[PDB]
């Protein structure tokens, strides 16, 4: 038959929502850092196991209770209220380390205005040395300690890392990036000044060009020689790296960063304009579309990496050995540097990347504004202007350490220390709370009342012992295994692990603080206080 | 070692044109710039322009933008320079200095013997 | 172009004396930590020879007599062990952008 009715209906509407930066930039870097192919199967396994049920649970909670991530626990569990503060701290860390990629992309777009792209050659433009540009057009040999012009450009112009000898010695502040991050923060502040965006017409104009330009880039990379050598590396089973390597932590981090659960974005964006409107048929489709977009982005990235490895006549997993989040600005730059209309396509790609990053960061900073107004509506809910400006100033003051000369040493630290374990333990705590303290039977009855269809046997067993046990096992494996990294011939100092553990603790310590603080205000003995604090607050 | 030679002496004729070559050897030719300076008898040095082998860029100082024509040739690695509208003032010595390999951008001390025209 | 002038005009050659040559770079700034400025030396009748590059590093085949110092606008040269062989003309060229120009040159002769 092949009616394709599912592809016909609702797909043109769902495909416009799952467009974030966690799938075009975060997924390729994580996949290449752990090897292609051996990461897709654990990724999809962890997804199907603990990302779709949590997504559906958060959507149902936001649709039923209709409250922010700080006010949700006022009707579920008053003890576990520090989850809101943990989510706020996690979002602050995000906005502190997430805007660096946006500033780099804006600087690249600004520098990509000339007719001659700086990423093609390194003929002593500003500061170069030990260059190798002619790959195969002149048929020259490749030797050790040789770098392409793109890597030298990224390392010496947009992120001056030679000024700092490491993380222990940070240099000054580059104004060339501050002048762009200030404009980025001003544009962000001018977009959430009112906070009224539910079904605007801007989605149909900022989500149609990204997809067509991504397909153009895909067909350009496929029409490029040396592409078949990268496809085999992206589709290799490699059952050895699944057994006893520890790839589940990165997969879970990528899942919780790309989907949405963990940052309180779903409970804040879904608590309005929707109530009992065809539930159980949106979260799965959104997750499927997001996974498809992530797979397409990873396929394009690996197709470019295969050509890059075939040109260098080296291994696929040895091209970018210590390169972290710089995988995009190198492979994409080298791919655009071979297109006929290099300048125009580069400008269009950077523009769509900037717009996608803006659309992705507008939802992250919104889950905190609407959350405080639900807990303190007598002081902050009236202004709406002095609070968003204050949080913007706070996020800008905290984003000055990542703008240092050692930027690659700070972004790599807050990437798996403030987002990996923290979001994981926050999700585990909230899931076990909703499962045991609130009761799975009450949640199932509420879902049946608000939708008219009870969840299946697979969903009623996930939040009980499937996702919480998996999250606890991943947390234990992360705490028992050294998460030490390596980047640019300098792995990390000894105190880097302690600094990362302290950073990942200040966001989680809010929950025990509120647990030990709530038991003091309520009078009575220990058991009486526990019984009084377990029951939710009555209206 | 990196050898660098030039042509021999010439004659500056009113209204004619000359051609000075610079054959470099001993390193990567199309990887570093090729400076061209002018030194009048008694006076100091005077920069003319630069040319990167490989059809990449073509720059000048500002006073010889119409009287100097830097031509490269990757076949024999001999950089040329064709002057136009000569006079009694252009009677000087033209050298050929190879630039550095990037960041520093200094002269690698591989200067020619000098093409003293008269 | 970046105007670069030298304040000294002519020094005196003396055994065991310090020589100071400075270049005016009022319109100049450091780009990536290395000062885009070089020091040359041209003997009478001989082609110019590289002496000190980047104003901090020593060139090729140059003794430890010449030592550069300074960053940003002002620069200096240390010619403390000056013998009768160091009688030449030293120039000053900057390599910031497309502004490559030489200086006036200071000849040393007693
Ligand atoms: C290009 O060549 C330079 C010069 O050799 C390399 O710089 C040095 O790096 C190597 C190891 O990478 C060290 O063993 C040397 O001691 C370094 N030299 C100095 C003076 O510190 C450079 O690594 C090469 N590759 C590039 C620049 O990508
Ligand atoms: C990468 C996309 C993964 C999509 C995974 C979808 C899983 C859907 C599971 C549905 C289980 C229904 C059980 C019904 C029992 C009566
Ligand atoms: C010198 C020209 C600078 C032009 C800067 C344009 C910045 C556009 C930002 C668009 C953000 C969506
Ligand atoms: C290379 C310098 C680029 C400067 C780009 C400035 C863009 C406007 C910034 C406005 C800040 C208020
Ligand atoms: C195993 C290393 C543990 C390091 C603990 C550092 C202190 C964590 C709590 C910090 C609270 C501000
Ligand atoms: C792409 C692998 C998908 C594995 C799960 C398939 C579920 C089909 C509906 C039961
Ligand atoms: C000297 C080490 C400084 C580390 C600063 C880390 C800041 C993280 C964001 C607050
Ligand atoms: C040399 C330091 C330049 C710093 C530019 C940004 C200053 C921000 C002050 C709030
Ligand atoms: C040379 C092989 C190219 C394969 C392209 C596959 C594209 C799949 C899009 C879903
Ligand atoms: C880890 C915190 C939860 C421990 C189990 C609590 C069970 C409560 C049953 C009423
Ligand atoms: C081998 C046991 C290691 C335990 C580490 C605990 C770290 C707690 C950080 C808050
Ligand atoms: C950590 C964020 C605290 C916000 C307090 C708002 C009153
Ligand atoms: C009113 C615009 C404020 C911008 C602040 C940027 C830090
Ligand atoms: C839409 C998919 C196009 C694939 C082209 C491969 C050459
Ligand atoms: C109104 C300005 C508030 C700044 C807060 C900085 C933490
Ligand atoms: C070395 C620069 C540190 C800046 C810290 C800003 C909070
Ligand atoms: C509906 C309750 C299911 C509990 C399953 C425990 C393994
Ligand atoms: C290969 C790991 C499979 C785990 C299955 C858990 C139900
Ligand atoms: C940062 C934790 C604060 C707990 C008390 C909130 C009123
Ligand atoms: C986990 C913190 C418990 C505090 C108990 C205080 C009585
Ligand atoms: C992922 C299987 C268990 C490893 C410890
Ligand atoms: C969220 C930082 C404090 C604002 C008043
Ligand atoms: C793999 C460690 C599990 C601890 C519960
Ligand atoms: C354990 C923290 C108590 C704060 C009042
Ligand atoms: Cl993803």
Residue numbers in the entry:
A (entry chain A): 79 to 617
B (entry chain B): 20 to 137
C (entry chain C): 21 to 130
Give the exact sentences the study uses for this entry.
We next determined the structure of SERT in the presence of K+ but in the absence of 5-HT and Na+, conditions under which SERT releases 5-HT into the cytoplasm and becomes primed to return to an outward-facing conformation. We overcame the difficulties associated with isolating apo SERT by purifying the transporter in the presence of 5-HT, reconstituting it into nanodiscs, and then removing weakly bound 5-HT by size exclusion chromatography (SEC) purification. TM1a adopts a slightly different conformation to the 5-HT–bound inward-open state in KCl and is more open than the inward-open SERT-ibogaine complex. The observation that TM1a samples many different orientations after opening of the intracellular gate is consistent with the heterogeneity found for TM1a in molecular dynamic (MD) simulations of LeuT and underscores the highly dynamic nature and flexibility of this crucial structural element. Unfortunately, we could not find unambiguous density for K+, leaving the important issues of where K+ binds, how it may stabilize the inward-open state, or whether it is simply the absence of Na+ that favors the inward-facing conformation unresolved.
The serotonin transporter (SERT) terminates serotonin signaling by using sodium and chloride gradients to drive reuptake of serotonin into presynaptic neurons and is the target of widely used medications to treat neuropsychiatric disorders. SERT belongs to the neurotransmitter sodium symporter (NSS) family that includes the dopamine (DAT), norepinephrine (NET), glycine (GlyT1 and GlyT2), and γ-aminobutyric acid (GABA) transporters. Extensive structural and functional studies on LeuT and MhsT, together with recent investigations of SERT and GlyT1 (12), have shown how an inverted pseudo-repeat of five transmembrane (TM) helices creates a substrate-binding site approximately halfway across the membrane together with adjacent ion-binding sites. Here, we present cryo–electron microscopy structures of SERT in serotonin-bound and serotonin-free states, in the presence of sodium or potassium, resolving all fundamental states of the transport cycle.
